[PDB]
Motif scaffolding. Structure first.
Motif, PDB file in Angstrom:
ATOM      1  N   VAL C  18       0.856  -1.174   0.000  1.00 44.81           N
ATOM      2  CA  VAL C  18       0.000   0.000   0.000  1.00 44.81           C
ATOM      3  C   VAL C  18       0.893   1.226   0.000  1.00 44.81           C
ATOM      4  O   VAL C  18       1.604   1.484   0.975  1.00 44.81           O
ATOM      5  N   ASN C  20       1.076   5.271  -0.451  1.00 43.72           N
ATOM      6  CA  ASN C  20       0.310   6.512  -0.377  1.00 43.72           C
ATOM      7  C   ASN C  20       1.252   7.667  -0.663  1.00 43.72           C
ATOM      8  O   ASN C  20       2.122   7.966   0.173  1.00 43.72           O
ATOM      9  N   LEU C  23       1.917  11.138   1.749  1.00 47.36           N
ATOM     10  CA  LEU C  23       2.626  11.155   3.017  1.00 47.36           C
ATOM     11  C   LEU C  23       3.853  12.053   2.940  1.00 47.36           C
ATOM     12  O   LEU C  23       4.425  12.291   1.877  1.00 47.36           O
ATOM     13  N   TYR C  82       3.774   9.347   8.324  1.00 51.13           N
ATOM     14  CA  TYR C  82       3.839   7.940   8.669  1.00 51.13           C
ATOM     15  C   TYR C  82       4.024   7.772  10.171  1.00 51.13           C
ATOM     16  O   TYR C  82       4.817   8.477  10.797  1.00 51.13           O
ATOM     17  N   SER C  87      -1.721   1.403  12.964  1.00 48.81           N
ATOM     18  CA  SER C  87      -2.132   1.066  11.611  1.00 48.81           C
ATOM     19  C   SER C  87      -2.560   2.299  10.833  1.00 48.81           C
ATOM     20  O   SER C  87      -2.489   2.305   9.602  1.00 48.81           O
ATOM     21  N   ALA C  88      -2.988   3.347  11.520  1.00 42.41           N
ATOM     22  CA  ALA C  88      -3.482   4.544  10.867  1.00 42.41           C
ATOM     23  C   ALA C  88      -2.351   5.533  10.600  1.00 42.41           C
ATOM     24  O   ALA C  88      -1.239   5.404  11.114  1.00 42.41           O
ATOM     25  N   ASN C  89      -2.647   6.525   9.770  1.00 44.61           N
ATOM     26  CA  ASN C  89      -1.748   7.648   9.575  1.00 44.61           C
ATOM     27  C   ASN C  89      -2.110   8.763  10.541  1.00 44.61           C
ATOM     28  O   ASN C  89      -3.216   8.816  11.076  1.00 44.61           O
ATOM     29  N   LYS C 107     -10.580   9.983   7.302  1.00 47.69           N
ATOM     30  CA  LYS C 107     -10.744   9.692   5.887  1.00 47.69           C
ATOM     31  C   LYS C 107     -11.127  10.950   5.116  1.00 47.69           C
ATOM     32  O   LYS C 107     -12.006  11.707   5.532  1.00 47.69           O
ATOM     33  N   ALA C 157      -7.034   1.751  11.607  1.00 50.56           N
ATOM     34  CA  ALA C 157      -7.261   2.226  10.248  1.00 50.56           C
ATOM     35  C   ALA C 157      -8.555   1.678   9.665  1.00 50.56           C
ATOM     36  O   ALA C 157      -8.806   0.474   9.707  1.00 50.56           O
ATOM     37  N   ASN C 196      -6.731   5.553   5.973  1.00 55.04           N
ATOM     38  CA  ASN C 196      -5.873   4.423   5.600  1.00 55.04           C
ATOM     39  C   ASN C 196      -6.655   3.110   5.568  1.00 55.04           C
ATOM     40  O   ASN C 196      -6.222   2.089   6.094  1.00 55.04           O
ATOM     41  N   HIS C 199      -5.382  -0.582   4.531  1.00 52.39           N
ATOM     42  CA  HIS C 199      -4.292  -1.195   5.276  1.00 52.39           C
ATOM     43  C   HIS C 199      -4.441  -2.709   5.327  1.00 52.39           C
ATOM     44  O   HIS C 199      -3.440  -3.433   5.337  1.00 52.39           O
TER      45      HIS C 199
END
Ligand SMILES: NCCC[C@H](N)C(=O)O
Ligand SMILES: [K+]
Ligand SMILES: [K+]
Ligand SMILES: [K+]
Ligand SMILES: [K+]
Ligand SMILES: [K+]
Ligand SMILES: [K+]
Ligand SMILES: [K+]
Ligand SMILES: [K+]
Ligand SMILES: [K+]
Ligand SMILES: [K+]
Ligand SMILES: [K+]
Ligand SMILES: [K+]
Ligand SMILES: [K+]
Ligand SMILES: [K+]
Ligand SMILES: [K+]
Ligand SMILES: [K+]
Ligand SMILES: [K+]
Ligand SMILES: [K+]
Ligand SMILES: [K+]
Ligand SMILES: [K+]
Ligand SMILES: [K+]
Ligand SMILES: [K+]
Ligand SMILES: [K+]
Ligand SMILES: [K+]
Ligand SMILES: [K+]
Ligand SMILES: [K+]
Ligand SMILES: [K+]
Ligand SMILES: [K+]
Ligand SMILES: [K+]
Ligand SMILES: [K+]
Ligand SMILES: [K+]
Ligand SMILES: [K+]
Ligand SMILES: [Mg+2]
Ligand SMILES: [Mg+2]
Ligand SMILES: [Mg+2]
Ligand SMILES: [Mg+2]
Ligand SMILES: [Mg+2]
Ligand SMILES: [Mg+2]
Ligand SMILES: [Mg+2]
Ligand SMILES: [Mg+2]
Ligand SMILES: [Mg+2]
Ligand SMILES: [Mg+2]
Ligand SMILES: [Mg+2]
Ligand SMILES: [Mg+2]
Ligand SMILES: [Mg+2]
Ligand SMILES: [Mg+2]
Ligand SMILES: [Mg+2]
Ligand SMILES: [Mg+2]
Ligand SMILES: [Mg+2]
Ligand SMILES: [Mg+2]
Ligand SMILES: [Mg+2]
Ligand SMILES: [Mg+2]
Ligand SMILES: [Mg+2]
Ligand SMILES: [Mg+2]
Ligand SMILES: [Mg+2]
Ligand SMILES: [Mg+2]
Ligand SMILES: [Mg+2]
Ligand SMILES: [Mg+2]
Ligand SMILES: [Mg+2]
Ligand SMILES: [Mg+2]
Ligand SMILES: [Mg+2]
Ligand SMILES: [Mg+2]
Ligand SMILES: [Mg+2]
Ligand SMILES: [Mg+2]
Ligand SMILES: [Mg+2]
Ligand SMILES: [Mg+2]
Ligand SMILES: [Mg+2]
Ligand SMILES: [Mg+2]
Ligand SMILES: [Mg+2]
Ligand SMILES: [Mg+2]
Ligand SMILES: [Mg+2]
Ligand SMILES: [Mg+2]
Ligand SMILES: [Mg+2]
Ligand SMILES: [Mg+2]
Ligand SMILES: [Mg+2]
Ligand SMILES: [Mg+2]
Ligand SMILES: [Mg+2]
Ligand SMILES: [Mg+2]
Ligand SMILES: [Mg+2]
Ligand SMILES: [Mg+2]
Ligand SMILES: [Mg+2]
Ligand SMILES: [Mg+2]
Ligand SMILES: [Mg+2]
Ligand SMILES: [Mg+2]
Ligand SMILES: [Mg+2]
Ligand SMILES: [Mg+2]
Ligand SMILES: [Mg+2]
Ligand SMILES: [Mg+2]
Ligand SMILES: [Mg+2]
Ligand SMILES: [Mg+2]
Ligand SMILES: [Mg+2]
Ligand SMILES: [Mg+2]
Ligand SMILES: [Mg+2]
Ligand SMILES: [Mg+2]
Ligand SMILES: [Mg+2]
Ligand SMILES: [Mg+2]
Ligand SMILES: [Mg+2]
Ligand SMILES: [Mg+2]
Ligand SMILES: [Mg+2]
Ligand SMILES: [Mg+2]
Ligand SMILES: [Mg+2]
Ligand SMILES: [Mg+2]
Ligand SMILES: [Mg+2]
Ligand SMILES: [Mg+2]
Ligand SMILES: [Mg+2]
Ligand SMILES: [Mg+2]
Ligand SMILES: [Mg+2]
Ligand SMILES: [Mg+2]
Ligand SMILES: [Mg+2]
Ligand SMILES: [Mg+2]
Ligand SMILES: [Mg+2]
Ligand SMILES: [Mg+2]
Ligand SMILES: [Mg+2]
Ligand SMILES: [Mg+2]
Ligand SMILES: [Mg+2]
Ligand SMILES: [Mg+2]
Ligand SMILES: [Mg+2]
Ligand SMILES: [Mg+2]
Ligand SMILES: [Mg+2]
Lengths: 46, 34, 271
Positions: C18, C20, C23, C82, C87-89, C107, C157, C196, C199
């Motif tokens: 994954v 992104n 970031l 990051y 697990s999330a940003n 989101k 996430a 995210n 994930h």
RNA sequence: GCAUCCGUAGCUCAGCUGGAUAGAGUACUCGGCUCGGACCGAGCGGCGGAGGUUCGAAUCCUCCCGGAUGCACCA
RNA sequence: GCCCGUU
RNA sequence: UUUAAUGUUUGAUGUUCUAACGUUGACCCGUAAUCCGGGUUGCGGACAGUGUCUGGUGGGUAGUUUGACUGGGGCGGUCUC
RNA sequence: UUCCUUGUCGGGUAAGUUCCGACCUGCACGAAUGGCGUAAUGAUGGCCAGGCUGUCUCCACCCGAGACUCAGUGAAAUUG
RNA sequence: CGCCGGAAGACCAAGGGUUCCUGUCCAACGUUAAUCGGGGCAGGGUGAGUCGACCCCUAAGGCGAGGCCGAAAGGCGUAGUCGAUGGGAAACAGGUUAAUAUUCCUGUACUUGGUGUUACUGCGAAGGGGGGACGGAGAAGGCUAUGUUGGCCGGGCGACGGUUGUCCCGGUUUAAGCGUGUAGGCUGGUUUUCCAGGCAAAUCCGGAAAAUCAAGGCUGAGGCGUGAUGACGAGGCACUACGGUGCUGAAGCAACAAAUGCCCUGCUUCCAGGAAAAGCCUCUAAGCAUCAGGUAACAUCAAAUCGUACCCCAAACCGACACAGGUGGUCAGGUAGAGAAUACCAAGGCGCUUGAGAGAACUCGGGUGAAGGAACUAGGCAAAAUGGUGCCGUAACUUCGGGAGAAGGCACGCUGAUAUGUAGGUGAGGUCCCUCGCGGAUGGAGCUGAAAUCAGUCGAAGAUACCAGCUGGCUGCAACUGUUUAUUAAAAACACAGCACUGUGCAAACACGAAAGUGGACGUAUACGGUGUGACGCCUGCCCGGUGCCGGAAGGUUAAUUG
RNA sequence: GAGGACCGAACCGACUAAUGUUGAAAAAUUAGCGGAUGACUUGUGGCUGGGGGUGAAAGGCCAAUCAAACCGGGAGAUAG
């Protein structure tokens, strides 16, 4: 090949030296036993 | 362990010498009476 | 965006990553960093208390605001970053007085968006309000359980919580597991979902990728001797017994919830 | 080679009422419905052999034959 | 309700 | 046998309450301190939790038992009259 | 995984209890204590071919270190 | 004469502790002898403001006043205090001892404090902010260490044909510091005004606004100058105990090649997202205020204590041994080579503490072999064979990456010419311009230098030595890279990415703990634990009677209690 | 210029054969062999303690000792 005794003076004194014996009650009984036997070297020290 | 040997003070476990099943050249085909 | 790797080697054939691009490529914001040294799954007795933990990459801890109690003052989102701890940003926001904080990135939130906390804020994704001022039916995340304690539910996430009812001093929440729970209405929540959300679409591909995350290998209990596990033993592949933990408690079906003081908050268990 | 359970109508199976009386399905035979099935109404058809106890045995003993099941390990 | 076939 | 009436009552369930008790909610102080204690308040609340007693479950762990005769042991058979 | 069993047929060999293909009578395969396939990979198991050879028919000679002799030093298992 | 030379050389850490050097002795020790020794005896030997420790600061972790908990002993932990393998001031060249030297001597330097004088001045922290301060991989450019050749200087004219030359041998070395600021890297600069932030304050950091300038600042190898009219220097001369000692001393430049070292804690890129605290800089609070303090110059003083010998891939450490074993870091010459491989060498170090003869069987380690070529054997075990670079060429199958170096084949030395040395690389002089210097353009001397073609030529053989894939066909198992029975088993076993079931709503389940507490996790169901299966492709059928688990509450049975 | 990518020294390992087996060595040597930018390897220090630890699981390892380490004690256990 590599044998079991690899000498290190810092690891010797930290493991079995005089302040390591004096820290616990069981280590102070090791010293009392050795003084009662009359041993010329109490601990493994310098 | 053999802790106060006077003839061999340097060694404590000596059964790898004279016991035939504990030598390095022992083979289990010697034990064929099974 | 998920990308499949090309099979140039056998350890690359199954990797799906994954990636992104929005970031922040750079160093994180240094006043909000702390040391975080690893445990090995060992407690202050020195014994392993959780298995399969060890190694992995070095990580620094980011202080993330889970409380969101800086009320009334607007904040602009600087960039998305990051975070190796979750697990999330996370997003770096800048308040009008000149304070910088890390929040969980929801989101749809980009660089340049405007968020605001407090009792009189607007109903848009990223704002944090008490749940007596949120409409019934909303999708929220980072939900408090006690007022002022900080957000504890729906942090991972792609997760969220739906507000199903508001009756009295309590609201009923539909949790991500399917559990109905009462939480009092003075607890805060943040509008939207957690970002995210792809994930869970990633594939590690190889054994070393699990070792980079600090996961050590799992040995099956049926592959041991009887002295080590209840499942051990056998001349060949034998099982013959009911499946249990390493400590003899029945797994595969037996419930372990024993908490008589929190049962009044749970309306319906998951199914 | 040893141990255990079975041999009942053409076929597949009950019956041990603790010894005094053998049935069921299907098959077959006869009559009817319509040419034949299906269907309806009737009927016929016998305890693995060889001794022993017994007032009397398919049943209980002893042996033989046939059929299955399990076991035949450590060298 | 069921009710096949006919070198 | 059968019921209602008055006077008096304990057990059951239910509903609130706060003051014991809980708080790994917030704030203040000891205090240069994410420990602890005290204070203020909020949320629970006679529940939870713990002690004594008690029914169930319990190879998770422990202590043990698992016969003899036998043309070797095992298997089979036998064990008293 | 097949006891009977070197089952039977076909291929490979002058000749094949192993190998490869098939048959099905599976003593006693079988679907996540997975079933059937599968490119790449393996100091993995089985089989065949080319090249190569003292592996062999069948050994011969040569170069070194011991063995043998002289001088010095000088053990061990075992043993009525 | 032989051996090593990415060590079998040199310097250390760890560990050892006098094994170091000199004299003397040969009983014992040394696998033999010993006049010798790491042996015996006696004497000598280790010199520091700058190297290291100590010291200041922290990591993992330890201990821990009060505290919380526990029959006792004790357990955990706050404030703190310790704890390097990490961060923090400063020295180089030459000479010298039988044995120490960045420590002594000579020359030339640098750092941090105390005190005093002069000049000027808002100083002050247990507080704020900055900085210190950090990953992997990759790529290129600029350099140096170092090497080679030329020039220069000194010497030589050769035991046997030739050797006054395009000949032979040797040397051509110089630091820290100080000064200058270059290749490169990063960043817009300045002023004014204001503000819910940085536990209070702040002129500092953060934020906002406005004006103005086209530049500024920070970082940085190397070079150059100085240090150096010195030091060193091939050799020569003079003594000598023939070990050594004393004096003098020429040249001391240039080009090319070039690192794994430096610029570089950079730049580019990726995901697995990459220590802490002090020194350092800066801001202010309580406070003090003609004080104290701060800043600069100068003078003066101080820089204590401990280590320093020697060995350190080994006869001194760990292995009972003067034991084919084990042991972390640093330095890295020549020719050939892609190379730290390999072969031969330099500096340097060694010939391994029993020898002398002989030339039987047999054993060990090797060389070669007529004709045959797996007939050997459980099995091609072991041997033999293949082997390099460039180019041509290369099947089934495939997850489209592979298979593949598939298979197979051709060329390869030397000499001459193309070209008295090419393509390419480097680049002096001269000339021109300015910004007048470590600048730019032009220019090409000198040096360096592949690869190819054509012709010729020698040998049986040109990748000639060392070095350096055997190849192909069918099939079982396991997807793969990995892991394992230290000392008879490396595998089909274990693990694995992937899949499924199940538990778990956070003071989570669970685990270690009589407990307090800790891990899970500074995570929160896209998370965490347990169990089974094991990439991928096509799939995963029927049975809930038995045992287990989950749900249910009517009825039956049913404990302590009550009596 | 990616890769638990490829060939191959250092470094780490231990598949085959021969020697050795009162050894040079209480597990090695010689000739081949595997990995060699990673689930790699290594130095220094620290933590986990015996029915306990740790274990990519072999009853492996925990100081040449392991289906329950070593040392002292009960202890002159008991021994048809
Ligand atoms: N821990 C090692 C001790 C060695 C001893 N000499 C022995 O023979 O056991
Ligand atoms: K597993
Ligand atoms: K097994
Ligand atoms: K309260
Ligand atoms: K209770
Ligand atoms: K008998
Ligand atoms: K007999
Ligand atoms: K079978
Ligand atoms: K034939
Ligand atoms: K045939
Ligand atoms: K293998
Ligand atoms: K194979
Ligand atoms: K002598
Ligand atoms: K010796
Ligand atoms: K250090
Ligand atoms: K800081
Ligand atoms: K500012
Ligand atoms: K400061
Ligand atoms: K010294
Ligand atoms: K002789
Ligand atoms: K090759
Ligand atoms: K498979
Ligand atoms: K292997
Ligand atoms: K295994
Ligand atoms: K799960
Ligand atoms: K934590
Ligand atoms: K069932
Ligand atoms: K069931
Ligand atoms: K059922
Ligand atoms: K590459
Ligand atoms: K390490
Ligand atoms: K034990
Ligand atoms: K020991
Ligand atoms: Mg010894
Ligand atoms: Mg796990
Ligand atoms: Mg798993
Ligand atoms: Mg096993
Ligand atoms: Mg068990
Ligand atoms: Mg089995
Ligand atoms: Mg009869
Ligand atoms: Mg028909
Ligand atoms: Mg018709
Ligand atoms: Mg209440
Ligand atoms: Mg038991
Ligand atoms: Mg007992
Ligand atoms: Mg008996
Ligand atoms: Mg018998
Ligand atoms: Mg055949
Ligand atoms: Mg077949
Ligand atoms: Mg099976
Ligand atoms: Mg099965
Ligand atoms: Mg199954
Ligand atoms: Mg198959
Ligand atoms: Mg002799
Ligand atoms: Mg002799
Ligand atoms: Mg040589
Ligand atoms: Mg001495
Ligand atoms: Mg000496
Ligand atoms: Mg002697
Ligand atoms: Mg000497
Ligand atoms: Mg001496
Ligand atoms: Mg002496
Ligand atoms: Mg120091
Ligand atoms: Mg403590
Ligand atoms: Mg007591
Ligand atoms: Mg300290
Ligand atoms: Mg010296
Ligand atoms: Mg600071
Ligand atoms: Mg230089
Ligand atoms: Mg002259
Ligand atoms: Mg001359
Ligand atoms: Mg001549
Ligand atoms: Mg500190
Ligand atoms: Mg030693
Ligand atoms: Mg030694
Ligand atoms: Mg020893
Ligand atoms: Mg020697
Ligand atoms: Mg040695
Ligand atoms: Mg080494
Ligand atoms: Mg070499
Ligand atoms: Mg030399
Ligand atoms: Mg000979
Ligand atoms: Mg021949
Ligand atoms: Mg010949
Ligand atoms: Mg020939
Ligand atoms: Mg043959
Ligand atoms: Mg033969
Ligand atoms: Mg071979
Ligand atoms: Mg083909
Ligand atoms: Mg290809
Ligand atoms: Mg292709
Ligand atoms: Mg080829
Ligand atoms: Mg030619
Ligand atoms: Mg097969
Ligand atoms: Mg495998
Ligand atoms: Mg492998
Ligand atoms: Mg073994
Ligand atoms: Mg082994
Ligand atoms: Mg072993
Ligand atoms: Mg072996
Ligand atoms: Mg092995
Ligand atoms: Mg799990
Ligand atoms: Mg499996
Ligand atoms: Mg199934
Ligand atoms: Mg139930
Ligand atoms: Mg690789
Ligand atoms: Mg190993
Ligand atoms: Mg080997
Ligand atoms: Mg080897
Ligand atoms: Mg290798
Ligand atoms: Mg290979
Ligand atoms: Mg390799
Ligand atoms: Mg790695
Ligand atoms: Mg260590
Ligand atoms: Mg086993
Ligand atoms: Mg021992
Ligand atoms: Mg051991
Ligand atoms: Mg025991
Ligand atoms: Mg006793
Ligand atoms: Mg005794």
């Amino acid at each position: 090949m590599k044998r079991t005794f690899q000498p290190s003076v810092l690891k010797r004194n930290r493991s079995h030296g005089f302040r390591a014996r004096m820290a616990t009650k069981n280590g102070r009984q090791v010293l009392a036993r050795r003084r009662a036997k009359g041993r010329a070297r109490l601990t493994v020290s310098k | 362990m053999e802790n106060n040997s006077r003839t061999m003070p340097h060694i404590r476990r000596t059964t790898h010498i004279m016991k035939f099943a504990h030598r390095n050249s022992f083979d289990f085909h010697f034990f064929n009476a099974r | 965006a998920v990308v499949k790797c090309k099979p140039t080697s056998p350890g690359r054939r199954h990797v799906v990553k994954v990636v992104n691009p929005e970031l922040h490529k750079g160093k994180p914001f240094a006043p909000l960093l702390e040391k975080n040294s690893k445990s090995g799954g060992r407690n202050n007795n020195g014994r392993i208390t959780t298995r399969h933990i060890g190694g992995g990459h070095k990580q620094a801890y980011r202080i993330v605001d889970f409380k969101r109690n800086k009320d009334g003052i607007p904040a602009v989102v600087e960039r998305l970053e990051y975070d190796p701890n979750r697990s999330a940003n996370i997003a770096l926001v800048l308040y009008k007085d000149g304070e910088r904080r890390y929040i969980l990135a929801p989101k749809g939130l980009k660089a340049g968006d405007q968020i605001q906390s407090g009792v009189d804020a607007a109903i848009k994704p990223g704002n944090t309000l008490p749940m007596r001022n949120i409409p019934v039916g909303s999708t929220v995340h980072n939900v408090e359980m006690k007022p002022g304690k900080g957000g504890q539910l729906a942090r991972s996430a792609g997760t969220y919580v739906q507000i199903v009812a508001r009756d009295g001093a309590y609201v009923t929440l539909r949790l991500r597991s399917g559990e109905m729970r009462k939480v009092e209405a003075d607890c805060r929540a943040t509008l939207g979902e957690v970002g995210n959300a792809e994930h869970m679409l990633r594939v590690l591909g190889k054994a070393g990728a699990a070792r980079w995350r600090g996961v050590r290998p799992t040995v099956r209990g049926t592959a041991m001797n009887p002295v080590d596990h209840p499942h051990g033993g056998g001349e060949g592949r034998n099982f013959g017994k009911h499946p249990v933990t390493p400590w003899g408690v029945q797994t595969k079906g037996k419930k372990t919830r024993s908490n008589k003081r929190t049962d009044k908050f749970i309306v319906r268990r998951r199914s």
